């Protein structure tokens, strides 16, 4: 059995989190290391 | 009049200082600024 109070909202929010992570990881966090720069010659 | 105790030694030591400065300034201190380098990109 399933409960509409918990199951449906959990599934939709989990799908929303998947979509948000897919949007973020590809573009926002892609150049997190390559664009990282420090003011030094070392 | 002159005194051999002070005048001769003063003159020879002053000439020695001139020669030492001539030797030092041309070569030793020539690249004091151009060779000065700091570990920074600023």
JSON list of C-alpha atoms in Angstrom, two decimals:
[
{"chain": "A", "resi": 1, "resn": "UNK", "atom": "CA", "xyz": [0.00, 0.00, 0.00]},
{"chain": "A", "resi": 2, "resn": "UNK", "atom": "CA", "xyz": [0.95, 3.66, -0.44]},
{"chain": "A", "resi": 3, "resn": "UNK", "atom": "CA", "xyz": [0.05, 6.97, 1.22]},
{"chain": "A", "resi": 4, "resn": "UNK", "atom": "CA", "xyz": [-0.68, 10.04, -0.88]},
{"chain": "A", "resi": 5, "resn": "UNK", "atom": "CA", "xyz": [0.61, 12.33, 1.88]},
{"chain": "A", "resi": 6, "resn": "UNK", "atom": "CA", "xyz": [4.18, 11.05, 1.71]},
{"chain": "A", "resi": 7, "resn": "UNK", "atom": "CA", "xyz": [4.83, 9.00, -1.41]},
{"chain": "A", "resi": 8, "resn": "UNK", "atom": "CA", "xyz": [3.71, 11.39, -4.15]},
{"chain": "A", "resi": 9, "resn": "UNK", "atom": "CA", "xyz": [5.38, 14.48, -2.69]},
{"chain": "A", "resi": 10, "resn": "UNK", "atom": "CA", "xyz": [8.56, 12.50, -1.98]},
{"chain": "A", "resi": 11, "resn": "UNK", "atom": "CA", "xyz": [8.72, 11.20, -5.55]},
{"chain": "A", "resi": 12, "resn": "UNK", "atom": "CA", "xyz": [8.04, 14.57, -7.17]},
{"chain": "A", "resi": 13, "resn": "UNK", "atom": "CA", "xyz": [10.56, 16.38, -4.94]},
{"chain": "A", "resi": 14, "resn": "UNK", "atom": "CA", "xyz": [13.18, 13.69, -5.60]},
{"chain": "A", "resi": 15, "resn": "UNK", "atom": "CA", "xyz": [12.61, 14.07, -9.35]},
{"chain": "A", "resi": 16, "resn": "UNK", "atom": "CA", "xyz": [12.90, 17.85, -8.94]},
{"chain": "A", "resi": 17, "resn": "UNK", "atom": "CA", "xyz": [16.22, 17.37, -7.13]},
{"chain": "A", "resi": 18, "resn": "UNK", "atom": "CA", "xyz": [17.44, 15.13, -9.96]},
{"chain": "A", "resi": 19, "resn": "UNK", "atom": "CA", "xyz": [16.54, 17.77, -12.55]},
{"chain": "A", "resi": 20, "resn": "UNK", "atom": "CA", "xyz": [18.17, 20.55, -10.54]},
{"chain": "A", "resi": 21, "resn": "UNK", "atom": "CA", "xyz": [21.35, 18.50, -10.11]},
{"chain": "A", "resi": 22, "resn": "UNK", "atom": "CA", "xyz": [21.41, 17.69, -13.83]},
{"chain": "A", "resi": 23, "resn": "UNK", "atom": "CA", "xyz": [21.09, 21.39, -14.67]},
{"chain": "A", "resi": 24, "resn": "UNK", "atom": "CA", "xyz": [23.74, 22.43, -12.14]},
{"chain": "A", "resi": 25, "resn": "UNK", "atom": "CA", "xyz": [26.48, 19.82, -12.57]},
{"chain": "A", "resi": 26, "resn": "UNK", "atom": "CA", "xyz": [26.90, 20.07, -16.35]},
{"chain": "A", "resi": 27, "resn": "UNK", "atom": "CA", "xyz": [27.29, 23.86, -16.59]},
{"chain": "A", "resi": 28, "resn": "UNK", "atom": "CA", "xyz": [27.64, 25.55, -13.19]},
{"chain": "A", "resi": 29, "resn": "UNK", "atom": "CA", "xyz": [30.21, 23.22, -11.62]},
{"chain": "A", "resi": 30, "resn": "UNK", "atom": "CA", "xyz": [31.95, 22.14, -14.84]},
{"chain": "A", "resi": 31, "resn": "UNK", "atom": "CA", "xyz": [34.79, 24.68, -14.69]},
{"chain": "A", "resi": 32, "resn": "UNK", "atom": "CA", "xyz": [35.14, 24.61, -10.89]},
{"chain": "A", "resi": 33, "resn": "UNK", "atom": "CA", "xyz": [38.80, 23.52, -11.14]},
{"chain": "A", "resi": 34, "resn": "UNK", "atom": "CA", "xyz": [39.95, 24.85, -14.53]},
{"chain": "A", "resi": 35, "resn": "UNK", "atom": "CA", "xyz": [38.73, 28.38, -13.75]},
{"chain": "A", "resi": 36, "resn": "UNK", "atom": "CA", "xyz": [40.19, 28.23, -10.23]},
{"chain": "A", "resi": 37, "resn": "UNK", "atom": "CA", "xyz": [43.14, 30.64, -10.15]},
{"chain": "A", "resi": 38, "resn": "UNK", "atom": "CA", "xyz": [45.47, 31.97, -7.44]},
{"chain": "A", "resi": 39, "resn": "UNK", "atom": "CA", "xyz": [47.63, 35.12, -7.45]},
{"chain": "A", "resi": 40, "resn": "UNK", "atom": "CA", "xyz": [51.01, 33.41, -7.34]},
{"chain": "A", "resi": 41, "resn": "UNK", "atom": "CA", "xyz": [53.87, 32.18, -9.51]},
{"chain": "A", "resi": 42, "resn": "UNK", "atom": "CA", "xyz": [54.35, 29.01, -7.47]},
{"chain": "B", "resi": 1, "resn": "UNK", "atom": "CA", "xyz": [101.75, 72.37, 7.02]},
{"chain": "B", "resi": 2, "resn": "UNK", "atom": "CA", "xyz": [100.86, 68.67, 7.03]},
{"chain": "B", "resi": 3, "resn": "UNK", "atom": "CA", "xyz": [101.20, 65.75, 9.44]},
{"chain": "B", "resi": 4, "resn": "UNK", "atom": "CA", "xyz": [102.39, 62.36, 8.21]},
{"chain": "B", "resi": 5, "resn": "UNK", "atom": "CA", "xyz": [100.36, 60.59, 10.90]},
{"chain": "B", "resi": 6, "resn": "UNK", "atom": "CA", "xyz": [96.99, 61.73, 9.56]},
{"chain": "B", "resi": 7, "resn": "UNK", "atom": "CA", "xyz": [97.24, 63.15, 6.06]},
{"chain": "B", "resi": 8, "resn": "UNK", "atom": "CA", "xyz": [98.99, 60.33, 4.20]},
{"chain": "B", "resi": 9, "resn": "UNK", "atom": "CA", "xyz": [96.91, 57.52, 5.70]},
{"chain": "B", "resi": 10, "resn": "UNK", "atom": "CA", "xyz": [93.71, 59.51, 5.17]},
{"chain": "B", "resi": 11, "resn": "UNK", "atom": "CA", "xyz": [94.54, 60.14, 1.51]},
{"chain": "B", "resi": 12, "resn": "UNK", "atom": "CA", "xyz": [95.53, 56.54, 0.78]},
{"chain": "B", "resi": 13, "resn": "UNK", "atom": "CA", "xyz": [92.47, 55.10, 2.55]},
{"chain": "B", "resi": 14, "resn": "UNK", "atom": "CA", "xyz": [90.19, 57.57, 0.74]},
{"chain": "B", "resi": 15, "resn": "UNK", "atom": "CA", "xyz": [91.72, 56.52, -2.59]},
{"chain": "B", "resi": 16, "resn": "UNK", "atom": "CA", "xyz": [91.24, 52.87, -1.59]},
{"chain": "B", "resi": 17, "resn": "UNK", "atom": "CA", "xyz": [87.57, 53.59, -0.84]},
{"chain": "B", "resi": 18, "resn": "UNK", "atom": "CA", "xyz": [87.20, 55.24, -4.25]},
{"chain": "B", "resi": 19, "resn": "UNK", "atom": "CA", "xyz": [88.69, 52.20, -5.98]},
{"chain": "B", "resi": 20, "resn": "UNK", "atom": "CA", "xyz": [86.51, 49.79, -4.00]},
{"chain": "B", "resi": 21, "resn": "UNK", "atom": "CA", "xyz": [83.38, 51.80, -4.81]},
{"chain": "B", "resi": 22, "resn": "UNK", "atom": "CA", "xyz": [84.33, 51.92, -8.50]},
{"chain": "B", "resi": 23, "resn": "UNK", "atom": "CA", "xyz": [84.77, 48.14, -8.53]},
{"chain": "B", "resi": 24, "resn": "UNK", "atom": "CA", "xyz": [81.53, 47.51, -6.65]},
{"chain": "B", "resi": 25, "resn": "UNK", "atom": "CA", "xyz": [79.06, 49.92, -8.26]},
{"chain": "B", "resi": 26, "resn": "UNK", "atom": "CA", "xyz": [79.65, 48.98, -11.90]},
{"chain": "B", "resi": 27, "resn": "UNK", "atom": "CA", "xyz": [79.24, 45.20, -11.53]},
{"chain": "B", "resi": 28, "resn": "UNK", "atom": "CA", "xyz": [77.96, 44.15, -8.10]},
{"chain": "B", "resi": 29, "resn": "UNK", "atom": "CA", "xyz": [75.13, 46.67, -7.73]},
{"chain": "B", "resi": 30, "resn": "UNK", "atom": "CA", "xyz": [74.34, 47.09, -11.43]},
{"chain": "B", "resi": 31, "resn": "UNK", "atom": "CA", "xyz": [71.49, 44.55, -11.58]},
{"chain": "B", "resi": 32, "resn": "UNK", "atom": "CA", "xyz": [70.15, 45.32, -8.09]},
{"chain": "B", "resi": 33, "resn": "UNK", "atom": "CA", "xyz": [66.72, 46.24, -9.49]},
{"chain": "B", "resi": 34, "resn": "UNK", "atom": "CA", "xyz": [66.47, 44.29, -12.75]},
{"chain": "B", "resi": 35, "resn": "UNK", "atom": "CA", "xyz": [67.35, 40.99, -11.05]},
{"chain": "B", "resi": 36, "resn": "UNK", "atom": "CA", "xyz": [65.01, 41.75, -8.13]},
{"chain": "B", "resi": 37, "resn": "UNK", "atom": "CA", "xyz": [62.09, 39.32, -8.40]},
{"chain": "B", "resi": 38, "resn": "UNK", "atom": "CA", "xyz": [59.10, 38.45, -6.21]},
{"chain": "B", "resi": 39, "resn": "UNK", "atom": "CA", "xyz": [56.94, 35.31, -6.20]},
{"chain": "B", "resi": 40, "resn": "UNK", "atom": "CA", "xyz": [53.69, 36.92, -7.31]},
{"chain": "B", "resi": 41, "resn": "UNK", "atom": "CA", "xyz": [51.54, 37.65, -10.35]},
{"chain": "B", "resi": 42, "resn": "UNK", "atom": "CA", "xyz": [50.62, 41.14, -9.12]}
]
